[PDB]
Design a protein around this ligand. Sequence first.
Ligand code: ISW
Ligand SMILES: Nc1ncnc2c1ncn2[C@@H]1O[C@H](COP(=O)(O)OP(=O)(O)NP(=O)(O)O)[C@@H](O)[C@H]1O
Ligand SMILES: [Mg+2]
Lengths: 573, 586
Amino acid sequence: MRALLPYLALYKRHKWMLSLGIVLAIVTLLASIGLLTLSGWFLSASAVAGVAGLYSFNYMLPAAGVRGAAITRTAGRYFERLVSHDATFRVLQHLRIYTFSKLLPLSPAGLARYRQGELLNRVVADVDTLDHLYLRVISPLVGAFVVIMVVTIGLSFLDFTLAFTLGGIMLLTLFLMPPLFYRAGKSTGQNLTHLRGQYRQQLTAWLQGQAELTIFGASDRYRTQLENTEIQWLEAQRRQSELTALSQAIMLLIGALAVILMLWMASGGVGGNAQPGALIALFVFCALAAFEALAPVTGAFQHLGQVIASAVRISDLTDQKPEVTFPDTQTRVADRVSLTLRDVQFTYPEQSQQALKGISLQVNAGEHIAILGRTGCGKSTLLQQLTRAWDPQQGEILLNDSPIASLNEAALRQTISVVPQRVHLFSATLRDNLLLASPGSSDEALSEILRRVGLEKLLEDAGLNSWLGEGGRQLSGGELRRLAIARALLHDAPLVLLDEPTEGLDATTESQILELLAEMMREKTVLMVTHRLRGLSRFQQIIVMDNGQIIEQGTHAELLARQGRYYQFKQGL
Amino acid sequence: KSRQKELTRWLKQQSVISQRWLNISRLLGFVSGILIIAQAWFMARILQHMIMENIPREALLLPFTLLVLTFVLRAWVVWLRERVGYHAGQHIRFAIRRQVLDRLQQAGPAWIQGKPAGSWATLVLEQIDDMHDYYARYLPQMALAVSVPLLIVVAIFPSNWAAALILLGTAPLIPLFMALVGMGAADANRRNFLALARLSGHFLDRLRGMETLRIFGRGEAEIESIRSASEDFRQRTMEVLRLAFLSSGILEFFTSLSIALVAVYFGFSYLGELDFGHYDTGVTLAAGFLALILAPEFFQPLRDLGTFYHAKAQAVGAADSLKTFMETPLAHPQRGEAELASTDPVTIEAEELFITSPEGKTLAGPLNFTLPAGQRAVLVGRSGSGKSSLLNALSGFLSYQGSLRINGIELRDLSPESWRKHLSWVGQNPQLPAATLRDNVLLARPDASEQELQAALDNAWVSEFLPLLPQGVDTPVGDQAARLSVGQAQRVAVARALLNPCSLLLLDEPAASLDAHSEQRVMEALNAASLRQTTLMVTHQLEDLADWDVIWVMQDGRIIEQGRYAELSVAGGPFATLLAHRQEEI
Ligand code: ISW
Ligand SMILES: Nc1ncnc2c1ncn2[C@@H]1O[C@H](COP(=O)(O)OP(=O)(O)NP(=O)(O)O)[C@@H](O)[C@H]1O
Ligand SMILES: [Mg+2]
């Protein structure tokens, strides 16, 4: 319950639309009770009057209350649906923005949980469930409470005992019955979640390993237990509807008890009257209509547990410490970047050596550099600490004679343009996949890049308007790499970080791309990690190294002249 | 005409699976209408005695008892009708899920790997379960919406025919107000749900790519993009909803008017202003209460049908995905009845082979190779050249329109169940589907001797890293073998393939992205295993293919070069270019 406080405070942005939608729900329910209560009284009042009371009845006042309670019930229902649906989409937008703003400062590290793609499909589902707190939890429960109180208060001007026993029955089953059924079905809802993820775990294994199961003749016996999990899963759902059937038969029995009590008690006297003629129907027809408000309260409290379970999950992610902070100072981005590294761990420690002294690289204001590592020995994590994904625990990373940590976040992204190994194709137009780099850029200047980087094929049909990503027009590694290079060229930054370019590509695209770097990024300082000895002759100051330690370094001719580690690379393997 | 009509039509054609349950719920809903009428009759009768005749409540014990008994019966029927409703939707989901899994196993891995594993769990778990409330609640309610209201009138008409016409007068009006504009804004609502689900994929797209938004400094420009996309959806949805909520508001007007008209008619009939609507026997107070008590329940089944709107809306969206899934045409590989005579190494033959995807696309062009029995061959080439398609076609996962003869017998004519017992495979991705590490190795034959398990564990070098596992050979691999690394999970796949003898061993880049140690142990076991039967290995480790007697260079789905390493490395052709490009990886 205390988990929902951060997301209840998001309601302050839209508090008049969210409170109008609850007020309109209360008014609509009160007009339904007030119409059937007035109608019930009017029949018994006119019946006891008879023909004799025809000319001394004053039916004009009820006539103004029967048309009043009809307009506010049809217009109250129409606008309660309208207002509470607009309000629901307002908080969904504000939940998506709030979650995105909290998830971004901790994007690389605090969010890289196991099966991140499967986590994010569970993040989006939790934001949707937090959006259901207003219409599916708060409005039914607050609306029922106010309707009971107004009915109890307004019905107490006739009889305190009768109004308090009717409102006492309705208040007890609003505060005691929803908690009782949540507690009763708590155990059945726990193995229902256990058996649902067991089925998803067994289905994924049976579907992903369909090629392995068919060849080894096990696809039939592993579907047998998959359908056996469904039988147990469907059994737990049967025991969950066995309890929703009870909460609807007991709601009908409680609303019957109120009517029987109103019939029995109001005949012994309403107020001080020994025989209340038309006042029995006023109380009996109030108990008939007032229990419409209590219909959703048990299912609303049931959904509150789901909303709370989502509130802890979202708060687990968002309320993490962003390990990287950026000063709020305006700085001038330089046209030349002289990157220098001092005692920095080029690779995450392997085998827990703890004695790997950081490298001492030095990249001048215009020179290309290629760090030649070995495959599978260790993930780089050098361009991660160079884009301030995390602070370097080893040494100092100075950026143009100044520390990297003393640079504004906005000015840090304008001085470094990194192409990553995993390049993301946003589900948007090709224009939107490239305006990412430069947000203000001419449409023709945008199109010139595509031709320049060897991606003329994307301008054939609906060029710069075709939908990329899940919508369609998927790209392969050869052409998806070119888009990453295209972004780094629109993002005109003095320093370019090349992460494993030309990896997994054929020999033809690799030569077309390495020639792109050498002629496109001629005035820029690139820092490329390859473990591929192709095109390094054009990269001055090659850095060949193993075990996170620079063995030797220099220009390509110097490496071959001394006949060292680099010479064995070309000469042997 | 409308897409939503052929989806609601599809949903009812699926409802015949549990028609006994829907008929019981329709019969129990008719019993509810009788008990609602009887309950209102004992209330109207009691109220008349207590108001007009001033009868003390202690002399009305018999009508009070009958009113309590008919309330308990009403609660019992609701309990029964709610449990019967679940059984209707459960047996429909169980049969559709069986159809989806049957159709997803017939298609095979050739079609399963087209979409991510999460895209298939969504269709099977989340989307099939989205249809339950349509069969459990909406269909029983839409049958109640015609049974109870027409039964209320039949009970009011004998007592008073003017109160019956008030309810029956609005009976055809209500349908033409939510079918004139309601049907106009019903498919529009269905498209709004698609937009909401698509807007939910625009949020997930921005979440999945915040590593790219971070490095480009576009974090504050995608908050506006979320704001713009969310505001465009709401503005478009609320304009549709301004017409779709009229049906809810109109139905609330006609239940208000009918309650008012019943009160006005009966109220002024007691005062003597009106003298019609009865059978000249005089209007009583019980006649007016019976109509007034039953006036809300004339419209309640229709008012509760709007509560169940999302049950239908979320099932039409689910039926949208499940109707296209069950109606896409797939090209299954033709299966025969013939069996192979002996378990000796098979001979592979091709003659203008054309591998075809399940959607009909041609994967590999004309192949005219020939692999004698017991000979070890290598498939090489650039990515996307059809090397895995040739292995998938030999496994029986892909259909071909040429010649592919195993020991002289076509592969179409071979029975897939008995062919694959003469076949072992490793695959590009391990995919250990069993529970523990021991059950994954024994997947070929679970009931094998403990000694034979140790022989396979030792040959594949799985035994050497077993002490490093918390539980040993019984260590659960977990979700997608996350417990053990890819290099040591690939050795479990190797031990699985070597547990049973085979006539053909298919290796699909078995050492692609392993660490340098598992590179050694896998190729140690697989070079020794390739000598015992016919073997076809796909690889890019072109340096080690010296003792393999056949090398096929596959490009653009076509084998463009054949020969051994001695003559291919020096010929300066397609393989020399591939070898030269391979020599740069360190
Ligand atoms: C997700 C978020 C959300 C949410 C939460 C929600 N939602 Fe809704 N609707 C309705 C209703 C309703 C309700 C009440 C019921 C009960 O009581 O239970 C509730 C509660 C709710 N709703 C909620 C109707 C009518 C019905 C009548 O009355 O007749 C309609 C038409 C519509 C529509 C729509 C759309 C578009 C299409 C959309 C999007 C959406 N929607 C959304 C959402
Ligand atoms: N089931 C399929 N449906 C449609 N296209 C497919 C299917 N399987 C493969 N393809 C495509 O057909 C071509 C050949 O693919 P494939 O046979 O996997 O080549 P490959 O050489 O094994 N690739 P790789 O393992 O990455 O080096 C590529 O365009 C594939 O993406
Ligand atoms: Mg392949």
